[PDB]
Design an enzyme around this catalytic site. Structure first.
Site, mmCIF file in Angstrom:
data_model
loop_
_atom_site.group_PDB
_atom_site.id
_atom_site.type_symbol
_atom_site.label_atom_id
_atom_site.label_comp_id
_atom_site.label_asym_id
_atom_site.label_seq_id
_atom_site.Cartn_x
_atom_site.Cartn_y
_atom_site.Cartn_z
ATOM 1 N N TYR A 197 9.351 11.753 -0.065
ATOM 2 C CA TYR A 197 8.499 11.758 1.141
ATOM 3 C C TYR A 197 8.874 12.954 2.030
ATOM 4 O O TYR A 197 10.075 13.310 2.077
ATOM 5 C CB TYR A 197 8.678 10.550 2.051
ATOM 6 N N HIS A 257 4.762 13.022 1.032
ATOM 7 C CA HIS A 257 4.111 13.571 -0.190
ATOM 8 C C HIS A 257 2.638 13.402 0.026
ATOM 9 O O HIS A 257 2.190 12.682 0.924
ATOM 10 C CB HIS A 257 4.634 13.073 -1.530
ATOM 11 N N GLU A 308 1.766 11.317 3.528
ATOM 12 C CA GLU A 308 2.223 9.995 4.014
ATOM 13 C C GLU A 308 3.724 10.046 4.200
ATOM 14 O O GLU A 308 4.379 10.762 3.450
ATOM 15 C CB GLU A 308 1.920 8.938 3.017
ATOM 16 N N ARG A 345 3.208 3.099 6.393
ATOM 17 C CA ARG A 345 3.177 4.560 6.402
ATOM 18 C C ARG A 345 2.300 5.128 7.497
ATOM 19 O O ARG A 345 1.290 4.627 8.007
ATOM 20 C CB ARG A 345 2.510 5.063 5.090
ATOM 21 N N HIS A 375 1.049 -1.438 2.728
ATOM 22 C CA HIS A 375 0.841 -2.100 1.443
ATOM 23 C C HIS A 375 0.784 -3.618 1.721
ATOM 24 O O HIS A 375 0.408 -4.428 0.819
ATOM 25 C CB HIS A 375 2.092 -1.990 0.595
ATOM 26 N N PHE A 377 -3.232 0.068 -0.486
ATOM 27 C CA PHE A 377 -3.008 0.067 0.954
ATOM 28 C C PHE A 377 -4.209 -0.481 1.685
ATOM 29 O O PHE A 377 -5.327 -0.482 1.145
ATOM 30 C CB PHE A 377 -2.998 1.518 1.512
HETATM 31 N N1 LIG Z 1 7.793 -4.521 1.785
HETATM 32 C C1 LIG Z 1 6.880 -4.169 0.905
HETATM 33 N N2 LIG Z 1 6.905 -3.050 0.120
HETATM 34 C C2 LIG Z 1 5.900 -2.747 -0.797
HETATM 35 C C3 LIG Z 1 4.734 -3.523 -1.071
HETATM 36 N N3 LIG Z 1 3.964 -2.918 -2.043
HETATM 37 C C4 LIG Z 1 4.639 -1.839 -2.348
HETATM 38 N N4 LIG Z 1 5.811 -1.668 -1.639
HETATM 39 C C5 LIG Z 1 6.853 -0.605 -1.616
HETATM 40 O O1 LIG Z 1 6.344 0.639 -1.145
HETATM 41 C C6 LIG Z 1 6.453 1.696 -2.107
HETATM 42 C C7 LIG Z 1 5.266 2.177 -2.899
HETATM 43 O O2 LIG Z 1 4.363 3.143 -2.310
HETATM 44 P P1 LIG Z 1 4.224 4.704 -2.443
HETATM 45 O O3 LIG Z 1 3.557 5.274 -1.207
HETATM 46 O O4 LIG Z 1 5.660 5.012 -2.707
HETATM 47 O O5 LIG Z 1 3.215 5.244 -3.576
HETATM 48 C C8 LIG Z 1 1.900 5.873 -3.603
HETATM 49 C C9 LIG Z 1 0.950 4.803 -4.219
HETATM 50 O O6 LIG Z 1 1.357 3.492 -3.907
HETATM 51 C C10 LIG Z 1 1.339 5.183 -5.696
HETATM 52 C C11 LIG Z 1 0.440 4.576 -6.716
HETATM 53 O O7 LIG Z 1 -0.923 5.006 -6.553
HETATM 54 O O8 LIG Z 1 1.300 6.652 -5.615
HETATM 55 C C12 LIG Z 1 1.307 7.088 -4.292
HETATM 56 N N5 LIG Z 1 -0.040 7.514 -3.785
HETATM 57 C C13 LIG Z 1 -0.499 8.794 -3.521
HETATM 58 N N6 LIG Z 1 -1.715 8.921 -3.052
HETATM 59 C C14 LIG Z 1 -2.126 7.644 -2.976
HETATM 60 C C15 LIG Z 1 -3.304 6.932 -2.567
HETATM 61 O O9 LIG Z 1 -4.300 7.538 -2.145
HETATM 62 N N7 LIG Z 1 -3.398 5.499 -2.630
HETATM 63 C C16 LIG Z 1 -2.320 4.689 -3.093
HETATM 64 N N8 LIG Z 1 -2.444 3.380 -3.136
HETATM 65 N N9 LIG Z 1 -1.197 5.356 -3.471
HETATM 66 C C17 LIG Z 1 -1.121 6.752 -3.417
HETATM 67 C C18 LIG Z 1 7.538 1.154 -3.072
HETATM 68 O O10 LIG Z 1 8.750 1.820 -2.853
HETATM 69 C C19 LIG Z 1 7.486 -0.381 -2.963
HETATM 70 O O11 LIG Z 1 8.736 -1.055 -2.817
HETATM 71 C C20 LIG Z 1 4.693 -4.714 -0.231
HETATM 72 O O12 LIG Z 1 3.790 -5.552 -0.247
HETATM 73 N N10 LIG Z 1 5.743 -5.015 0.710
#
Ligand SMILES: Nc1nc2c(ncn2[C@@H]2O[C@H](COP(=O)(O)O[C@@H]3[C@H](O)[C@@H](CO)O[C@H]3n3cnc4c(=O)[nH]c(N)nc43)[C@@H](O)[C@H]2O)c(=O)[nH]1
Ligand SMILES: [Ca+2]
EC number: 4.6.1.24
Length: 104
Positions: free
Chosen positions: A38, A40, A58, A77, A92, A100
């Site tokens: 991040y 990213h 984000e 985020r 999320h 999201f």
């Molecule tokens: N506490 C908590 N944590 C969560 C939950 N769901 C996921 N997480 C946590 O958050 C993190 C995941 O999210 P990231 O932002 O890291 O990941 C991004 C996205 O989730 C992944 C898969 O697509 O690539 C990226 N990503 C990049 N661009 C995009 C986009 O436009 N939409 C989405 N949904 N994601 C995008 C993890 O580390 C996980 O533990 C939840 O319900 N509760």
């Protein structure tokens, strides 16, 4: 009252500004933190209603009030653009898998 509510997490405008500033600085420095690198790019696969232009980035916003420095990013985020304009606050929480939803 909360300026942004992400699930059960409450943030005020000041919480967001501080997070955003941190994120944007790493962005301009071409630096990252955390296993997920991040800040990213944020693709906007969700198709939200941003009133600011892309590209978007984000950066985690933490309920503890601390600035993200690595480790688990939690679910919330801050989304900012190239001009350091706030696009929105998303989470999320309440979204299936890794999708999201917006903070209200
Ligand atoms: N506490 C908590 N944590 C969560 C939950 N769901 C996921 N997480 C946590 O958050 C993190 C995941 O999210 P990231 O932002 O890291 O990941 C991004 C996205 O989730 C992944 C898969 O697509 O690539 C990226 N990503 C990049 N661009 C995009 C986009 O436009 N939409 C989405 N949904 N994601 C995008 C993890 O580390 C996980 O533990 C939840 O319900 N509760
Ligand atoms: Ca706060």
């Amino acid at each position: 009252a909360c300026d942004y509510t992400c699930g059960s997490n409450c943030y005020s405008s000041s919480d967001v500004s501080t997070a955003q500033a941190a994120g944007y600085k790493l962005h301009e420095d071409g630096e990252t933190v955390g296993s997920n690198s991040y800040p990213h790019k944020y693709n906007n696969y969700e198709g939200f209603d941003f009133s600011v232009s892309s590209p978007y980035y984000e950066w985690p916003i933490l309920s503890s009030g601390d600035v993200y420095s690595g480790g688990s990013p939690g679910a919330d985020r801050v989304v900012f653009n190239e001009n350091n304009q706030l696009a929105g606050v998303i989470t999320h929480t309440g979204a299936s898998g890794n999708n999201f939803v917006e903070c209200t």
